[PDB]
Amino acid sequence: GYSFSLTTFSPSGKLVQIEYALAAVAGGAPSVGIKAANGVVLATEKKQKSILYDERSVHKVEPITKHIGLVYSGMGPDYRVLVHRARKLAQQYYLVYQEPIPTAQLVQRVASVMQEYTQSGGVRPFGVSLLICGWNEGRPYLFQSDPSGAYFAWKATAMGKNYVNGKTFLEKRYNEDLELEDAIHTAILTLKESFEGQMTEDNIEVGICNEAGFRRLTPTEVKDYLAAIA
Amino acid sequence: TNRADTLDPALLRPGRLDRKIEFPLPDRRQKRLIFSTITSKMNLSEEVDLEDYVARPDKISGADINSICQESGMLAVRENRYIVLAKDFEKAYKTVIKKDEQEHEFYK
Amino acid sequence: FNGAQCKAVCVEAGMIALRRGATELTHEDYMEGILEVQAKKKANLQYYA
Amino acid sequence: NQYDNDVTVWSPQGRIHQIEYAMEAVKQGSATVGLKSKTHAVLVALKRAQSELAAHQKKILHVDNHIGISIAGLTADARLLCNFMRQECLDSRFVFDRPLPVSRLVSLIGSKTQIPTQRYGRRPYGVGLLIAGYDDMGPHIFQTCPSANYFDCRAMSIGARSQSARTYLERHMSEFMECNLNELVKHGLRALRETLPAEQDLTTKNVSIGIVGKDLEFTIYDDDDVSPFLEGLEERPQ
Amino acid sequence: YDRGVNTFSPEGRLFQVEYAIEAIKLGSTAIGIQTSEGVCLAVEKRITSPLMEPSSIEKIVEIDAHIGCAMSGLIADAKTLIDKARVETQNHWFTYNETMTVESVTQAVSNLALQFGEEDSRPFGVALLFGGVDEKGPQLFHMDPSGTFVQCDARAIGSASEGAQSSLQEVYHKSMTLKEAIKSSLIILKQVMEEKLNATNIELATVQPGQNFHMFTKEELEEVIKDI
Amino acid sequence: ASGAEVKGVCTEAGMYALRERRVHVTQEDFEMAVAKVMQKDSEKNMSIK
Amino acid sequence: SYDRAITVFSPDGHLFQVEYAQEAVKKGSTAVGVRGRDIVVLGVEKKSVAKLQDERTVRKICALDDNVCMAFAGLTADARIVINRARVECQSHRLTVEDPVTVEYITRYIASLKQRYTQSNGRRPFGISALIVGFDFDGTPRLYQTDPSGTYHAWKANAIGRGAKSVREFLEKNYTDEAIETDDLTIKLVIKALLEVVQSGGKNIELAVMRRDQSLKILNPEEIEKYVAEIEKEKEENE
Amino acid sequence: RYDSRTTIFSPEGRLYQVEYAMEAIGHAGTCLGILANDGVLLAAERRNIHKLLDEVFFSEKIYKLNEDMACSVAGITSDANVLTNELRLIAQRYLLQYQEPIPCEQLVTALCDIKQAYTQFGG
Amino acid sequence: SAGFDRHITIFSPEGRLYQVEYAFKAINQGGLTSVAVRGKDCAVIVTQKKVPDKLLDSSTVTHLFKITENIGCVMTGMTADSRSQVQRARYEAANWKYKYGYEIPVDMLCKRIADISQVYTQNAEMRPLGCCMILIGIDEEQGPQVYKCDPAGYYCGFKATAAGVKQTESTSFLEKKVKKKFDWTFEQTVETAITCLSTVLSIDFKPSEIEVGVVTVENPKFRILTEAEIDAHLVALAE
Amino acid sequence: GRLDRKIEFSLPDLEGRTHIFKIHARSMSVERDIRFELLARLCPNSTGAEIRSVCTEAGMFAIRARRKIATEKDFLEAVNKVIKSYAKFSATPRYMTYN
Amino acid sequence: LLNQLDGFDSRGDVKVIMATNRIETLDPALIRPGRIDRKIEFPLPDEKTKKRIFQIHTSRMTLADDVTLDDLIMAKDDLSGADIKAICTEAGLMALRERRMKVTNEDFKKSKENVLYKKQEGTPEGLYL
Amino acid sequence: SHEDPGNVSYSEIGGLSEQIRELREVIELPLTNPELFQRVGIIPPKGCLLYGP
Amino acid sequence: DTLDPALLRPGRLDRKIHIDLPNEQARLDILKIHAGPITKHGEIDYEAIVKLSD
């Protein structure tokens, strides 16, 4: 019975309310994202609870600009909040500099926002881990954040249920050199490793990032591609 | 037991762990097996399908399949038939751990 | 006054009349059993002016 | 009893005990008695001292040309509501260029003391106001409470052992309405001489009388226009 | 429990102010005596070290040309009240070309003796003795942390004030003189102090209507002490 | 680790050779045993520090 | 009450946290200071050199003006804040009043800032105790000390930090009215005080003086060695 | 016992969050600098050396802060971004004010005052 | 578990927070049932009333709150949260109409209400408005819509929709009923709504207890049915 | 009708402690020129048994030096011993802030 | 012991001294007056006498006198004299372990870090400073 | 054990007829006959709990 | 509630069945059980007893 709340350190350890938010992230819906040579592939795992829900209303894959994709693994109600913050911030950058914002500067400022919520002492942290990507100046990128304010840079990663198992498959399956199609193939493979047995044109939801810009794929080509891709 | 806060300064150790093996629990594909074995103890009319509720996220850990079997078959013993309906599955999914449920489906 | 204080008042009427060596009880000694402050104390009093 | 600390908490019997504790803090003041005739309103209080040599802590204080208050309880809140009272008096005396009716002033007092009884961060005011005034319809004797449930009466009495005073007020409230100032004031101190234990007598220096009249401005008196008020008495019936 | 300035008691009362009235008692003593000839006042310094320079310890400070003071207990709450009291009498002289009388001074102090509030800070820990000469002659005044301000004819504060009041009520009456009250005060002092009475322990402060300036005795106090 | 998780990896690599059928104990068998008795402790997105 | 927080009185009338923030001062390094009649002198002990750094930045004696000097004990960060604000305050006094700054004014400022810092809501009290030595008005030497309560308190000699009772007991057993200064008895008195330090290692001694017209003079640990030598010579002459 | 918040003191008197921030330092990446004239160097340990990163940042612990100063870092990572931005902004405001580079000791004391502002206040 | 006694909005171990999943049955203290259905170019709300009193009125027990001229809603849970949420919805729809010049689509309104509930959830020291809201409306190029807003701030929206007390059973009937691919010719919708509530609650009652709110792409105005035509539909499904 | 009075007492007031000062001053070897009310101020909460301890401790100081005529300073340092230097160790004082 | 020690069987002149380290397990029936009058603690000593106790414990050995015990004297904040005993003897034991008459300062390091389990008196503090 | 007085049957109680019949099916049956349980082949159940005010 | 959820798993105890506070017919029937050995007359207002009880 301690820590409680956000203003004071432990006797020796860490920030238990951030560790619990990370556990709530790890208890979330799975996702996978892979940086290839020319593009970046994002893929989530979106199961409706009943047969009643519609798949055209809520969207996991969400663009920040015309060339910057972003998925998560956590809670949509906080996700939309920090999405809207990132929207307004990226449009403020484009007001200041009249140039589309680079992804490193996005990740700096979004990390500053999340860090400002981790400061004391009445607000809770986000239960949201991001996977940010974009194609700025030829070389595409991939940046994962976390509730603690930190950030990383990945070649391919995963987040959600069985991220450890999916990551051990990613270490074996993926490599340095692929194209976007082979990236989607290995991405649906590593998401199909951990998802339920019935995977359709609606249970997944996939957006890509070519150098020609962000592209959020449709259920038509998603159903064409995952119609027993291997 | 369930709670694991009792040892490993001495059970699972460098050197002591020669066959001291950690044992978690089974994945999906196992509830189907329990549904195959314990419902083979009853008579199984000839056609009341069974994968229709593994697709429900029941999570009913692997004793209470027999609780479903007991309450369901003996509810058919209120009719004293040995032959099984799908109504046994609804009455053993609204008299068993239908409490928590189902949902919550927020926050993932 | 509860019955506790009923007993307290009548025995204090005995005792107050037992002070001065009166021959029997006296009405003012009953009243000073009652003016044994109705067992409500003290006060210091300080700030109540 | 672990719910019995703050103003915000409703009790599981619904009685917020901070209000009850403020009432009990009011019950430990000095005795005071206010009562009105048809034409004159008189409030009489009792003084005390810290020691023999020191002077007595005063209770009747002036407010306005036709308003005067008695008091019991805390003195910081007393002077706080005094300054607010004088302020609201000179506010309407500035704006409307009329003397205030008493009822709207005491409604403003209740609305003033409402906020420290509902939000968190202020205490209820330990206060013992007995207000005498003159609107167009004659004298008024109001009383307050720390629960801001102000009352109108014809004769009240608050403070320590003030209940025998209330019995006297019961057995003379029919007689109060007809008389002029002098026997009215001596009915007031024929309440105060029963607000005291019987083994000591009310002297000059410990009593205070404030009269406001329909043509008479509010005036406090101390020992010298009270030496006329203290004669005209007999002893208590021993 | 009671823990906090914003909670009463089941029987009264604070319980923060009461702990302040307790916190008075640890301070050094002081004795002021009203006489119609004028107000005299005395204090004990309780000098600890020979390095402790005696004229730097303030007990009697100067508010006005005819208004003195003495402090108690905590030092710095007294410093706050003295600073503000000095400022406000000067404001009175500003808007009225006259001297703020001592009752008006102490009402002006006890307007915020209890303005204690941390939201919407703590209660002060000092007892004050006020002497001065208004138009009604001399005045001697005593306040407390709770703002319950009263006039006193000869008040004693702080440590050992019980026997100070008792032996003070033994000797005092209304038609005393000045020097008799001075030596009667320092008799009570060297019955309630612990060290030998000498030139450095105590200090006097006397104000007269014809001697409004210099409410102090400086080493003629030696001559006063050696007359006992 | 404290002394002989060496022996844990050796034994569980022998167990992997036991479930399978081999007589040569290669390095990948030991590395699978490392994956058995070296994972948990694991768990990143926690470097912070 | 309890040892939580600064706003509550004790059941017997104390403030626990002023007394408890005095303990960090009571368990800090020692620094003494005396006044001669024309030259003032003070200094700190426990140089505590860890064999591998510089120490010109860790100086515990600084100045605000050309007339006044500093010292402290307790923890050093609160000393850094108070000194930073004190420089500003001394200069702001120089802004309006065109005098050289009197020592009594800046000590009243330090104690007033310290107390209004202690009164407020949840601000931790400054656990220091400064020594403020200067000679301005007709070259009159003064030295005042502070407290976490905020009580400026004028002395003639002083001892703070660890075991300050023993050190002040030596100044008690020395402190002669004669003579005078005479800047030689004052130098030798500093030598006797630093010899009376809690350790008196001979190399951890750091002393700086002011002759009431000059600026601060940092000494050299060879002159102090001859001072220790003549102290040992007088100790042999006692026998 | 006397834990609850960063303020107030412990009964000896020590501090709680100061030592516990130090014990939060102790489990982090190792840095050092060396004694050299005509140059100075830094050393740093790579946390998270896993094979699926990018290393495209050129700097994870070093922060080239003004022009002629860099800084390593150790401890909780994301507080340091708040600190490095603010430190760069302090030195840059100095350069704006004087058009002379910052002489580094008032820079260090500025950051120490920034940290000390959260050591004193509460909570 | 807790342990932590879940008093404020923090994260507990493994891994949830308990305040919102206590707020999810503040709906369940309402004692009330709501069903929404979208089949075709219409949309139907149905909700009963629990009036035991003859002294109580019948017009002002209405839960169907006409948000705007093309958007309706129904509320369950406690009444004060519901009505305050409704005035927030009206105010923000009017804000849309002022700022952007045209009628708000029902999606953005649910997004804005969800965001308000999330801000009420993100910052503490406010109760998280324990009521659930179902919206309906017609949009051009999308037909009709049915949406649900959570107290947590999780909006969603879908074909056959139900929230309240007994809606695990209602969604069980709507899985067992919206699985056959027939069209829904508006009396199919009204009949399935009345009979789904009539099988969940199993009452088969007067036309004076349920309230029916409809919207159709022939008159896009929100419309509340009358006792006569409610009786007409009820005897039209009476075989 | 058996045990019906319940005589009350508690800690003495101040003058009770002066009377106990009289009592345990007269029954041992002190000097008859000293006062006690200052010592009575120094005992806000104490017992007459602890007044016996105070008088025997002033006797301990009167053993230390060869004293059969107890000064005021003997009882001064006796009370200073008992209530401030033996209440627990010595160091609840050692700050001014007050005087 | 209670009924015999300071019961009856008249006391007179029989000196009895009892000694402990801790006081928690003491029945207060024996702590009360009549039976035991004076209560006497002992402070772990100041450094001003640590210099003498370290000197005298090192008074009867050979030692390379360049080394400074003031490190050891200032270091351990709650030293007893058994600490000083074991230090001043065990440093000579570490030196004479390899037959050296005089002791190096890192033999004092080894000695003190044997004697105290985890010699943890540096920061905290360490950083007064 | 043998302090137990036998009572009247369930004619004293009522309004729990569902609980009477169903709890009878979970208590009384396998000692009347345990082999309808063995006609279907299922092991009989074990126990229940009563609760409320 | 305070029973450990290791005991709430079926097989050990099959189901937790609830006995409620009675309804109108329940109160009436158990009342007429209790109305038995009574020297009553034609006066027994059953509905007032059951409805005025809650």
PDB file of N, CA and C in Angstrom, chain D residues 18-64:
ATOM      1  N   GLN D  18     -20.639  19.268  12.256  1.00  0.00           N
ATOM      2  CA  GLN D  18     -19.904  20.524  12.380  1.00  0.00           C
ATOM      3  C   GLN D  18     -20.838  21.664  12.748  1.00  0.00           C
ATOM      4  N   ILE D  19     -22.079  21.590  12.274  1.00  0.00           N
ATOM      5  CA  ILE D  19     -23.091  22.571  12.621  1.00  0.00           C
ATOM      6  C   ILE D  19     -23.471  22.437  14.085  1.00  0.00           C
ATOM      7  N   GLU D  20     -23.622  21.196  14.548  1.00  0.00           N
ATOM      8  CA  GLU D  20     -23.906  20.930  15.952  1.00  0.00           C
ATOM      9  C   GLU D  20     -22.769  21.398  16.858  1.00  0.00           C
ATOM     10  N   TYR D  21     -21.525  21.224  16.410  1.00  0.00           N
ATOM     11  CA  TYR D  21     -20.382  21.667  17.203  1.00  0.00           C
ATOM     12  C   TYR D  21     -20.300  23.183  17.246  1.00  0.00           C
ATOM     13  N   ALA D  22     -20.685  23.847  16.157  1.00  0.00           N
ATOM     14  CA  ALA D  22     -20.719  25.303  16.173  1.00  0.00           C
ATOM     15  C   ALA D  22     -21.824  25.818  17.085  1.00  0.00           C
ATOM     16  N   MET D  23     -22.954  25.112  17.131  1.00  0.00           N
ATOM     17  CA  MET D  23     -24.014  25.438  18.080  1.00  0.00           C
ATOM     18  C   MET D  23     -23.517  25.330  19.513  1.00  0.00           C
ATOM     19  N   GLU D  24     -22.810  24.240  19.816  1.00  0.00           N
ATOM     20  CA  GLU D  24     -22.254  24.069  21.153  1.00  0.00           C
ATOM     21  C   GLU D  24     -21.157  25.079  21.469  1.00  0.00           C
ATOM     22  N   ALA D  25     -20.438  25.562  20.454  1.00  0.00           N
ATOM     23  CA  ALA D  25     -19.496  26.651  20.683  1.00  0.00           C
ATOM     24  C   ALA D  25     -20.218  27.959  20.973  1.00  0.00           C
ATOM     25  N   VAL D  26     -21.411  28.138  20.405  1.00  0.00           N
ATOM     26  CA  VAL D  26     -22.227  29.299  20.747  1.00  0.00           C
ATOM     27  C   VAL D  26     -22.754  29.189  22.170  1.00  0.00           C
ATOM     28  N   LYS D  27     -23.052  27.971  22.628  1.00  0.00           N
ATOM     29  CA  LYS D  27     -23.613  27.772  23.963  1.00  0.00           C
ATOM     30  C   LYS D  27     -22.667  28.126  25.107  1.00  0.00           C
ATOM     31  N   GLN D  28     -21.386  28.364  24.837  1.00  0.00           N
ATOM     32  CA  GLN D  28     -20.423  28.696  25.874  1.00  0.00           C
ATOM     33  C   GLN D  28     -20.055  30.171  25.906  1.00  0.00           C
ATOM     34  N   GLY D  29     -20.911  31.058  25.407  1.00  0.00           N
ATOM     35  CA  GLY D  29     -20.670  32.479  25.521  1.00  0.00           C
ATOM     36  C   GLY D  29     -21.212  33.052  26.813  1.00  0.00           C
ATOM     37  N   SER D  30     -21.312  34.373  26.842  1.00  0.00           N
ATOM     38  CA  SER D  30     -21.945  35.011  27.980  1.00  0.00           C
ATOM     39  C   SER D  30     -23.447  35.061  27.791  1.00  0.00           C
ATOM     40  N   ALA D  31     -24.149  35.219  28.904  1.00  0.00           N
ATOM     41  CA  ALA D  31     -25.589  35.333  28.832  1.00  0.00           C
ATOM     42  C   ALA D  31     -25.963  36.729  28.364  1.00  0.00           C
ATOM     43  N   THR D  32     -27.056  36.804  27.621  1.00  0.00           N
ATOM     44  CA  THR D  32     -27.552  38.065  27.105  1.00  0.00           C
ATOM     45  C   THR D  32     -29.032  37.897  26.825  1.00  0.00           C
ATOM     46  N   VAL D  33     -29.764  39.001  26.896  1.00  0.00           N
ATOM     47  CA  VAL D  33     -31.220  38.963  26.833  1.00  0.00           C
ATOM     48  C   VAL D  33     -31.683  40.158  26.023  1.00  0.00           C
ATOM     49  N   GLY D  34     -32.515  39.901  25.031  1.00  0.00           N
ATOM     50  CA  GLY D  34     -33.109  40.962  24.241  1.00  0.00           C
ATOM     51  C   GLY D  34     -34.604  40.772  24.130  1.00  0.00           C
ATOM     52  N   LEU D  35     -35.325  41.880  24.265  1.00  0.00           N
ATOM     53  CA  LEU D  35     -36.776  41.879  24.335  1.00  0.00           C
ATOM     54  C   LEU D  35     -37.283  43.265  23.980  1.00  0.00           C
ATOM     55  N   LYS D  36     -38.452  43.304  23.365  1.00  0.00           N
ATOM     56  CA  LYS D  36     -38.989  44.541  22.837  1.00  0.00           C
ATOM     57  C   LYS D  36     -40.392  44.769  23.367  1.00  0.00           C
ATOM     58  N   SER D  37     -40.742  46.035  23.459  1.00  0.00           N
ATOM     59  CA  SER D  37     -42.101  46.492  23.651  1.00  0.00           C
ATOM     60  C   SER D  37     -42.678  46.814  22.279  1.00  0.00           C
ATOM     61  N   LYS D  38     -43.834  47.473  22.261  1.00  0.00           N
ATOM     62  CA  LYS D  38     -44.381  47.937  20.995  1.00  0.00           C
ATOM     63  C   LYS D  38     -43.610  49.122  20.440  1.00  0.00           C
ATOM     64  N   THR D  39     -42.901  49.870  21.281  1.00  0.00           N
ATOM     65  CA  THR D  39     -42.246  51.085  20.831  1.00  0.00           C
ATOM     66  C   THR D  39     -40.756  51.117  21.109  1.00  0.00           C
ATOM     67  N   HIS D  40     -40.242  50.258  21.983  1.00  0.00           N
ATOM     68  CA  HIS D  40     -38.831  50.288  22.327  1.00  0.00           C
ATOM     69  C   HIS D  40     -38.267  48.882  22.434  1.00  0.00           C
ATOM     70  N   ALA D  41     -37.074  48.705  21.878  1.00  0.00           N
ATOM     71  CA  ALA D  41     -36.370  47.433  21.884  1.00  0.00           C
ATOM     72  C   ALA D  41     -35.109  47.547  22.727  1.00  0.00           C
ATOM     73  N   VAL D  42     -34.952  46.629  23.680  1.00  0.00           N
ATOM     74  CA  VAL D  42     -33.865  46.660  24.653  1.00  0.00           C
ATOM     75  C   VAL D  42     -33.159  45.312  24.632  1.00  0.00           C
ATOM     76  N   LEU D  43     -31.837  45.330  24.481  1.00  0.00           N
ATOM     77  CA  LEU D  43     -31.032  44.125  24.623  1.00  0.00           C
ATOM     78  C   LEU D  43     -29.982  44.366  25.699  1.00  0.00           C
ATOM     79  N   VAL D  44     -29.856  43.407  26.613  1.00  0.00           N
ATOM     80  CA  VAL D  44     -29.000  43.513  27.790  1.00  0.00           C
ATOM     81  C   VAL D  44     -28.084  42.296  27.811  1.00  0.00           C
ATOM     82  N   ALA D  45     -26.786  42.526  27.968  1.00  0.00           N
ATOM     83  CA  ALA D  45     -25.803  41.452  28.006  1.00  0.00           C
ATOM     84  C   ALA D  45     -25.070  41.442  29.344  1.00  0.00           C
ATOM     85  N   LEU D  46     -24.183  40.463  29.486  1.00  0.00           N
ATOM     86  CA  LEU D  46     -23.406  40.266  30.699  1.00  0.00           C
ATOM     87  C   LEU D  46     -21.924  40.265  30.377  1.00  0.00           C
ATOM     88  N   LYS D  47     -21.166  41.024  31.155  1.00  0.00           N
ATOM     89  CA  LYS D  47     -19.728  41.122  30.986  1.00  0.00           C
ATOM     90  C   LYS D  47     -18.996  40.126  31.884  1.00  0.00           C
ATOM     91  N   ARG D  48     -17.777  39.781  31.477  1.00  0.00           N
ATOM     92  CA  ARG D  48     -16.859  38.978  32.271  1.00  0.00           C
ATOM     93  C   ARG D  48     -15.466  39.557  32.123  1.00  0.00           C
ATOM     94  N   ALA D  49     -14.540  39.036  32.919  1.00  0.00           N
ATOM     95  CA  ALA D  49     -13.171  39.522  32.932  1.00  0.00           C
ATOM     96  C   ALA D  49     -12.208  38.347  32.966  1.00  0.00           C
ATOM     97  N   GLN D  50     -10.948  38.626  32.622  1.00  0.00           N
ATOM     98  CA  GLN D  50      -9.905  37.610  32.710  1.00  0.00           C
ATOM     99  C   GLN D  50      -9.390  37.475  34.135  1.00  0.00           C
ATOM    100  N   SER D  51      -9.289  38.590  34.845  1.00  0.00           N
ATOM    101  CA  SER D  51      -8.857  38.573  36.228  1.00  0.00           C
ATOM    102  C   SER D  51      -9.595  39.689  36.960  1.00  0.00           C
ATOM    103  N   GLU D  52      -9.226  39.906  38.223  1.00  0.00           N
ATOM    104  CA  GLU D  52      -9.881  40.936  39.022  1.00  0.00           C
ATOM    105  C   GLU D  52      -9.505  42.332  38.545  1.00  0.00           C
ATOM    106  N   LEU D  53      -8.220  42.559  38.282  1.00  0.00           N
ATOM    107  CA  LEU D  53      -7.746  43.907  38.002  1.00  0.00           C
ATOM    108  C   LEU D  53      -8.139  44.368  36.607  1.00  0.00           C
ATOM    109  N   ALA D  54      -8.300  43.434  35.676  1.00  0.00           N
ATOM    110  CA  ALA D  54      -8.534  43.801  34.293  1.00  0.00           C
ATOM    111  C   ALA D  54      -9.959  44.298  34.094  1.00  0.00           C
ATOM    112  N   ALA D  55     -10.159  44.994  32.981  1.00  0.00           N
ATOM    113  CA  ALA D  55     -11.479  45.456  32.593  1.00  0.00           C
ATOM    114  C   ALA D  55     -12.289  44.308  31.998  1.00  0.00           C
ATOM    115  N   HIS D  56     -13.550  44.584  31.698  1.00  0.00           N
ATOM    116  CA  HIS D  56     -14.468  43.555  31.243  1.00  0.00           C
ATOM    117  C   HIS D  56     -14.592  43.561  29.727  1.00  0.00           C
ATOM    118  N   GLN D  57     -14.626  42.367  29.144  1.00  0.00           N
ATOM    119  CA  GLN D  57     -14.787  42.224  27.705  1.00  0.00           C
ATOM    120  C   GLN D  57     -16.201  42.615  27.283  1.00  0.00           C
ATOM    121  N   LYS D  58     -16.315  43.620  26.422  1.00  0.00           N
ATOM    122  CA  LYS D  58     -17.620  44.170  26.074  1.00  0.00           C
ATOM    123  C   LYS D  58     -18.346  43.326  25.030  1.00  0.00           C
ATOM    124  N   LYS D  59     -19.676  43.392  25.080  1.00  0.00           N
ATOM    125  CA  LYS D  59     -20.594  42.635  24.236  1.00  0.00           C
ATOM    126  C   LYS D  59     -21.486  43.513  23.375  1.00  0.00           C
ATOM    127  N   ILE D  60     -22.167  44.496  23.956  1.00  0.00           N
ATOM    128  CA  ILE D  60     -22.986  45.383  23.142  1.00  0.00           C
ATOM    129  C   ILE D  60     -22.073  46.330  22.383  1.00  0.00           C
ATOM    130  N   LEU D  61     -22.124  46.271  21.060  1.00  0.00           N
ATOM    131  CA  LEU D  61     -21.347  47.186  20.248  1.00  0.00           C
ATOM    132  C   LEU D  61     -22.261  47.883  19.256  1.00  0.00           C
ATOM    133  N   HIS D  62     -21.830  49.061  18.837  1.00  0.00           N
ATOM    134  CA  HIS D  62     -22.620  49.888  17.950  1.00  0.00           C
ATOM    135  C   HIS D  62     -22.482  49.392  16.518  1.00  0.00           C
ATOM    136  N   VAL D  63     -23.523  49.609  15.713  1.00  0.00           N
ATOM    137  CA  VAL D  63     -23.439  49.313  14.285  1.00  0.00           C
ATOM    138  C   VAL D  63     -23.806  50.555  13.487  1.00  0.00           C
ATOM    139  N   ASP D  64     -24.997  51.092  13.730  1.00  0.00           N
ATOM    140  CA  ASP D  64     -25.521  52.171  12.909  1.00  0.00           C
ATOM    141  C   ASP D  64     -26.475  52.978  13.783  1.00  0.00           C
TER     142      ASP D  64
END
